[PDB]
Amino acid sequence: MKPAARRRARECAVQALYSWQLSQNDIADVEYQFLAEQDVKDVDVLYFRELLAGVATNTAYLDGLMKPYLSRLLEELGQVEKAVLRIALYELSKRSDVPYKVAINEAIELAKSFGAEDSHKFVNGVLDKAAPVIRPNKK
RNA sequence: CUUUAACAUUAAGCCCUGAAGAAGGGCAAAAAUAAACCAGCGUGUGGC
């Protein structure tokens, strides 16, 4: 139902937000470098801007959501898992054009292809315990 | 896909002496060699 440009924009947004949260710089300069120096010919511009703006304005919101779900972890919290959970919970909080099962399926694909071979079940557990709370309608 | 993965470690000898896995050697193979502290010789002169 959706072309590969949305998937490419989502993966480039995962890469850009991981680079922002690990390099710890300004979001505007890193965003301008990532849009003027990387492959953006198959990247949805408005999807990228709205997703990064929502993550940048809901840093503390998604951290407060993640804070009750950082107890039973054997190791400590990684950064790739945090980026996948932030993008997955913003795609399940305010995004109306993206469906519920479609966003969960893309989040599971991102967690299996980027997080780990063992952290994608943690991502799916946090999503299954948070997305009916955030979206009881499951839209 | 519902709440962090991982048990690894496969190589260096043979023989003799020795109470031993305490120690002493040879051989098949080789990169590389401050301090306290006892105490002549060659010229001249002259002499005999």
- The separation, in Å, between residue A42 CA and nucleotide B42 C1' comes to 110
- Taking CA atoms, A99 is separated from A24, A32, A84, A92, A105, in Å, by 31, 29, 17, 9, 10
CA nearest neighbour of A10 among A128, A116, A111, A110: A110
Q: What angle do CA A41, A84, A29 make, to 5 degrees?
A: 50
Rounded-to-integer distance, Cα A14 and Cα A83, Å:
7
Give the up-direction half-sphere exposure of residue A44: CA atoms within 13 A in the CB hemisphere: 17
Strand B contacting residues by CB (7 Å) = A 68-69, 71-78, 81, 105, 108, 116-122, 124-129
Please give the full DSSP string across chain A, using - where no structure is assigned. Answer: ---HHHHHHHHHHHHHHHHHHHHT--HHHHHHHHHHHS--TTS-HHHHHHHHHHHHHSHHHHHHHHGGG-SS-SS---HHHHHHHHHHHHTTTT-SSS-HHHHHHHHHHHIIIII-SSSHHHHHHHHHHHHHHH-SS--
Measure A70 CA to B4 C1' (Å): 12
- CA(A120)–C1'(B10) in Å? 36
- For strand B, the positions having any atom within 7 A of a protein Cβ are 1-6
CA distance A84 to A17: 9
Rounded Cα distance between A122 and A131, Å, is 14
| Resolution (Å units) | 3.7
Q: Is residue A111 within 8 Å of residue A104, measured between CB atoms?
A: no
Closest nucleotide (C1' vs CA) to A74 is B4
The amino acid sitting at A67 is: K
Task: Check: CB of residue A103 under 8 Å from CB of residue A95.
Answer: yes
Interatomic CA distance for residues A133 and A29, integer angstroms = 35
Q: How was this structure obtained?
A: cryo-EM
